Amino acid sequence: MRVVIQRVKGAILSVRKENIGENEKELEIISEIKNGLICFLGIHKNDTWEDALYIIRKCLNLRLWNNDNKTWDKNVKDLNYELLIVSQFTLFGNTKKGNKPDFHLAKEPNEALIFYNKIIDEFKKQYNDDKIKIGKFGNYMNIDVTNDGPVTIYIDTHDINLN
Amino acid sequence: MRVVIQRVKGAILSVRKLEIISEIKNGLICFLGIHKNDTWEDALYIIRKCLNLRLWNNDNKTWDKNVKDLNYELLIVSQFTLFGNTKKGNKPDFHLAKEPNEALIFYNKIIDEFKKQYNDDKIKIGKFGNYMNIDVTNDGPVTIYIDTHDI
Ligand SMILES: Nc1ncnc2c1ncn2[C@@H]1O[C@H](CO)[C@@H](NC(=O)[C@H](N)Cc2ccc(O)cc2)[C@H]1O
Ligand SMILES: Nc1ncnc2c1ncn2[C@@H]1O[C@H](CO)[C@@H](NC(=O)[C@H](N)Cc2ccc(O)cc2)[C@H]1O
């Protein structure tokens, strides 16, 4: 499993509508957060629940905010901050083959959706259901973000010696 | 070397005493981390990928057009947090990151090469070693990660 985590002052997420006509507004705002983390999440074809549990534990525990004087002191839960979780199969874009990315390592969409929904539910259980916001799996999205730092963290659970 | 590439409709980068120093419209924001053991060849690979990866569509083909094809812009942001050591702690420790003073000179070379491979006008950068606020419109979103030590 792969994730890019970014520290933000805020984020507004909109999604492309299913029902689109000519001469119409096509994107609709579905999620908004203030301070916290945006997590772009990619599910690998061979991911297990243990991969997901590692990512969730890490995201919730990363100490990415300063306190009064102390550097890298507080995690997202400590400050009652929010998380915006966005499904992102492009993290499996293989860029070694030339200029056209291929995404064959990404978990197949039907199982990935179920997996994604389990992950969101687990984020809500481990933290606070009011603090977890999501996009719309499988849809084009627009995200207006204020990056704070910036602070960008990348985790691939396959780089980890997980059992 | 590590990069996070995000496809954007625009980005506005500001720094403290906030003041806007860089802005782009459509293109890429590239968060770039330099490893203590990186070589010029690592840099060249990342620059090549940022400039040539086909992260936009043609009318009839997906993933067919790159940033240079569309005459779009790039915002390059130095980001040592990509070497956070999250494997070993929950507080980021940047020991795998290249020493900042030496990294700055290396980064200068990288930016020059971006400008050489593309053009001066289309490359914008942040403020190395400073706090930055970056207002971004992520388009897709489309996020690409490359670690040259993994190829
Ligand atoms: N394996 C997966 N992991 C995470 N998300 C996934 C996975 N498989 C499918 N998805 C979701 O379905 C969408 C299309 O594949 C994925 N969408 C995206 O990655 C962004 N909308 C970017 C995008 C843009 C255009 C495009 O043709 C494909 C993808 C994700 O929401
Ligand atoms: N090895 C490096 N690779 C990329 N950038 C680097 C590297 N070493 C130093 N830098 C630059 O100096 C800053 C940390 O001293 C880096 N900045 C950042 O990572 C972001 N402004 C986040 C940040 C913000 C504040 C802070 O106290 C520490 C980090 C980068 O501009």
Author numbering:
A (entry chain A): 1 to 163
B (entry chain B): 1 to 17, 27 to 160
Show sentences the authors wrote.
PfDTD was co-crystallized with a post-transfer substrate analog D-Tyr3AA, which mimics D-tyrosine attached to the 3′-OH of the terminal adenosine (A76) of tRNA. Similar post-transfer substrate analogs have been used extensively to study proofreading mechanisms in atomic details for both Class I-specific CP1 editing domains and Class II-specific editing domains.The crystal structure of PfDTD in complex with D-Tyr3AA has been solved in two different crystal forms: crystal form I at a resolution of 1.86 Å in C2 space group and crystal form II at a resolution of 2.2 Å in P21 space group. Crystal forms I and II have two and eight copies per asymmetric unit, respectively. Since all copies present a similar picture, the higher resolution crystal form I is discussed here unless otherwise mentioned. An invariant Phe137 provides base-stacking interaction to the adenine ring. The main chain nitrogen of Gly138 along with the side chain hydroxyl of Ser87 holds the 2′-OH. The α-amino group of D-tyrosine has an interaction with carbonyl oxygen of Gly149 from the cross-subunit Gly-cisPro motif. Such a capture of the carbonyl oxygen and the amino group of the incoming D-aa, automatically positions the Cβ in such a way that it makes favorable C-H…O hydrogen bond with the carbonyl oxygen of Pro150, again from the cross-subunit Gly-cisPro motif. The cis conformation of Pro150 is the key to ensuring that it cradles the chiral centre thus preventing both the amino group and the Cβ from occupying the position of Hα.
